[PDB]
């Protein structure tokens, strides 16, 4: 069937699995949070 519509939005899932606390509350999540910060990125997380 037709494809391309893989991203079906949902604020709950988007925030729960890519949000700031979804990464600030884990070792691996924190590591990528600080890596983006060191690179100088404005938007640390979702």
């Amino acid at each position: 069937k037709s494809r391309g519509n893989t991203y079906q939005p949902s604020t709950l899932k988007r925030k729960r699995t890519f949000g700031f606390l979804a990464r600030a509350k884990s070792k691996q999540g924190s590591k990528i949070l600080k890596r983006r910060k060191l690179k100088g990125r404005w938007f640390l997380s979702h």
């Binding site: 949902s10 604020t11 709950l12 925030k15 938007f43 997380s45 979702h46």
Partner: protein
């Protein structure tokens, strides 16, 4: 013809200027699921009741 002063296609959107951009902006009250609750630091008074109400302290 949504805009009578634009007879031909010039790339103009149906509304707004750009269809894309940043999505990592902080959440606000008007947007989210029906179970979302942002708040406006405008209520620190009282205690929610067990049934689902409020009691002003």
């Amino acid at each position: 013809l949504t805009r009578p002063w634009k007879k031909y296609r010039d790339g103009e959107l149906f509304y707004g200027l750009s269809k894309v951009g940043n999505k990592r902006v902080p959440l606000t009250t008007k947007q989210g699921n029906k179970t979302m609750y942002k708040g406006t630091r405008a209520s620190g008074i009282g205690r929610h009741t067990k049934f689902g109400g409020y009691v002003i302290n």
